[PDB]
From a paper:
Escherichia coli possesses two acyl ornithine aminotransferases, one catabolic (AstC) and the other anabolic (ArgD), that participate in L-arginine metabolism. The arginine-succinyl transferase pathway of E. coli provides nitrogen for growth via a series of succinylated intermediates. In conclusion, the E. coli AstC protein, involved in arginine catabolism, is a PLP containing transaminase that is structurally similar to the related protein ArgD, which is the transaminase enzyme used in arginine synthesis. From the biochemical data, it appears that AstC and ArgD are biochemically similar, consistent with the ability of astC to complement an argD deletion. Both have comparable steady state kinetic values, with a strong preference for the acylated ornithine derivatives AO (AstC and ArgD) and SO (for AstC, at least) over ORN itself.
The native, non-tagged AstC that was purified from E. coli was the apo-protein, with no bound PLP, as suggested by the lack of color of the purified protein, and confirmed by a UV-Vis absorbance spectrum, which showed no absorbance in the region of 320 to 500 nm (data not shown) which is characteristic of PLP containing proteins. We were able to obtain crystals of the apo-protein, although they diffracted to only medium resolution (2.75 Å). Consistent with our spectrophotometric data, there was no electron density for the PLP co-factor in the crystal structures of protein obtained directly from purification. The A and B protomers in the asymmetric unit differ substantially, with the A chain having electron density for almost the entire length of the molecule (Gln3 to Ser402) and the B chain starting at residue Ala21 and ending at Ser402. The B chain also has no electron density corresponding to two loops in the A chain from His142 to Ala163 and Val274 to Gly283, respectively. The two protomers do not form a dimer, rather dimers are formed through crystallographic symmetry for both, the A with another A protomer and the B with another B protomer. The loops missing from the B protomer form part of the dimer interface; analysis of the PISA output shows that the A–A interface buries about 4763 Å2 whereas the B–B interface buries only 1906 Å2. The St-ArgD structures are most similar to the B protomer of the apo-enzyme structure of AstC reported here, in that the N-terminal ∼23 amino acids of the structures are missing as are six residues in a loop from 277–282. The reconstituted enzyme was more heat stable than the apo-protein; holo-AstC and apo-AstC had apparent Tm values of 46°C and 43.5°C, respectively.
Residue numbers in the entry:
A (entry chain A), B (entry chain A): 3 to 402
The structure:
């Protein structure tokens, strides 16, 4: 009758090795497990819970809609999805929006759009997708092939063709591969799963120029960096560089699964009826929640609060690092932050993460070499201080 | 300030041409638009709203969970997702489950699993996927290439390689393509988007034998046919044939986006840590709702009620067809039903569907030649009678 962690190994296809403990409830940046142990949540659902757990406003938005209707599919549109498209359109470089269920699906849409756009304006010979080493764009066949970790793509071959990977942050690597045959350049403004590595300002200017020069669409995968995470609504705003396509998901639904492709008028025009689609994308429920999310997150008091919190994190992480000497650098932007291990401790991010869990704070990794922080954007000063106290206890246990 | 249908053409990437009217609320099999016109909903969200609109029980399940927590991502499991895995395991041939956000993602998982399984037990040369003409498996690059409507895949080339299509319901077509190099045979037990065409009993026995003989995994895409739609929990039960992998989505979450891959112990074992994944899949919210759905749908009174309703539909559709002579045949199973147009009216399913909307009933199409019905499983006798009255009015207007 009771549910146990041993139940997980018996019943789930074993793609994840999750925590020994099982969460049963949360509020804000706190989470509790079956035994009532209390965690401070700096993982934030992997950058998804931008307003923390069980937020009262997301809850009324969800239940208000849920009492009218949840879903019709896309033969019918709805008021929530349309208010949401509008909020996005007004807030970003975008003119049109397409909604779906996840980051992976949004990137699939973006790449398909790019392929179609080049076939239609230039010719069927123009198919190349240029992405970057260590990129993560999701787990579908297409998006994992565009993603730059061959370990996640090897087994599933033959992979869609005409994808090449340049070195992140290397403008020369990219120009080597970008030419008149390229339809798309897909890039994360900050590499998330790949070590929390920010783009340099030059690198994104350079890509934009290469795109212009060669008529490829520039796609920014802001699935991990979007919706306030950097201190601005999107990273493209921080950098000053405008993409042709922008994918967003994750924080956008603050816990409810949703993704979006933002596009210029020129690009959208090309996706005609029946050329793509989704069954659940743009449903009333998801749209009512993301709508509320945008409204709460897209305010100067929140966004400025993100930069404030960045400083809380960085200051205290350095104090900590000065004492214990784990990290060679602390990097990232707003509230996507990475502590990179120095060579003494290389490859042990996971162990530190497990130590943190024992001390009662949830952090992530980003490769074996980086401890990743992605707390809720409305994380309180007190939760930050407590959670960093626990993280420090953890670093102590770990150093031995 | 008010939201209008003209707003849809201004703001959405135009992949859908939805209805002139916009739904604002529903209850059961009734839906209302902005002007308060009343529709009977035989489209049921494209076979998704198995318990109709804004169902009171789905609502408390949703709000109960939503007050504990919505999401952590998969470094952490949860009680809802585990109760759900268990319900499924107990109810089906499956031993293990993997959860995701949609049918498309579930099929991506299934095919990737199959590719990996063959690479691991036989060798990297064994990669072939055999699917069928007119199959629909979703809109990712991989699943649309496995899908059998070249119009939806052409523009996005180069497509993943080693996919071939046999003729549905043709055992000889399939044996021509299935050999020792095949890793997977993916099939819909009833082709949904492709004309509501049921599989013959022979055809699925035959595929199962071919699979066994050649060591390919048999995958049944029950995304459209699963969760009661046929009168049994899944179509594989109606047919007597057990697949190796089963994908399900759609009705499973009764409106909330969710998909699942059901697998035998032998197959699951092969998907090791980090080989696949999803950010939202298996989240508490989705799992609490599908859990309730399964509990309401997987009962002899519902399932038997589905067969009862099948008869209501078929009887009255024939009365109607005898009067107006639109349809050459009425086909399908349980509450997935197709009225196939005779040659006089070929290609005009969409027009009939538009006539139906004017008369105040929502039906679907399945190609230009078939009017498709997928009402909620708990559709009441009265809603069925009223909606078929309106459908009949519609058929009258249409015949001229």
């Amino acid at each position: 009758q009771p549910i146990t962690r041993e139940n997980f190994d018996e019943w789930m296809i074993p793609v994840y090795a999750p925590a020994p403990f099982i969460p049963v409830r949360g509020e804000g940046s706190r989470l509790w497990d079956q035994q009532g142990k209390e965690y401070i949540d700096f993982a934030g659902g992997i950058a998804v819970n931008a307003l923390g757990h069980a937020h009262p406003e997301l809850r009324e938005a969800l239940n208000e809609q849920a009492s009218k209707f949840w879903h019709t599919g896309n033969g019918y549109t709805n008021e929530p999805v349309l208010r949401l498209a509008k909020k996005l359109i007004d807030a970003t470089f975008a003119d049109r929006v397409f909604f779906c269920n996840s980051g992976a699906e949004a990137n699939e849409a973006a790449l398909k759009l790019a392929r179609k756009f080049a076939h239609d304006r230039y010719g069927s010979h123009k198919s190349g997708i240029v992405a970057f080493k260590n990129a993560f764009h999701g787990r579908t066949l297409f998006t994992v092939s565009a993603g730059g970790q061959p370990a996640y793509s090897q087994d599933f071959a033959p992979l869609p063709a005409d994808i090449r990977h340049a070195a992140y942050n290397d403008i020369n690597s990219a120009s080597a591969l970008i030419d008149d045959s390229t339809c798309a350049v897909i890039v994360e403004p900050i590499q998330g799963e790949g070590g929390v590595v920010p783009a340099s300002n030059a690198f994104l200017q350079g890509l934009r120029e290469l795109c212009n020069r060669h008529n490829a669409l520039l796609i920014f995968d802001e699935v991990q960096t979007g919706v306030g995470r950097t201190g601005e609504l999107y990273a493209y705003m921080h950098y000053g560089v405008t993409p042709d396509l922008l994918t967003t998901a994750k924080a956008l639904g603050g816990g409810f699964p949703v993704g979006a492709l933002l596009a210029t008028e020129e690009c959208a025009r090309v996706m005609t009826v029946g050329t793509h689609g989704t069954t659940y994308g743009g449903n009333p429920l998801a749209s009512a929640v993301a709508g509320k999310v945008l409204e709460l997150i897209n305010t100067p008091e929140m966004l400025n609060g993100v930069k404030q919190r960045h400083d809380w994190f960085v200051e205290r992480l350095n104090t900590i690092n000065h004492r214990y000497g784990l990290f060679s650098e602390v990097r990232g932007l707003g509230l996507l932050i990475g502590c990179v291990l120095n060579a003494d401790y290389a490859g042990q991010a996971k162990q530190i993460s497990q130590e943190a869990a024992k001390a009662g704070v949830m952090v992530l990794i980003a490769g074996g070499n980086v401890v990743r922080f992605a707390p809720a954007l409305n994380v309180s000063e007190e939760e930050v201080t407590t959670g960093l106290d626990r993280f420090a206890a953890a670093c102590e246990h770990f150093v031995s």
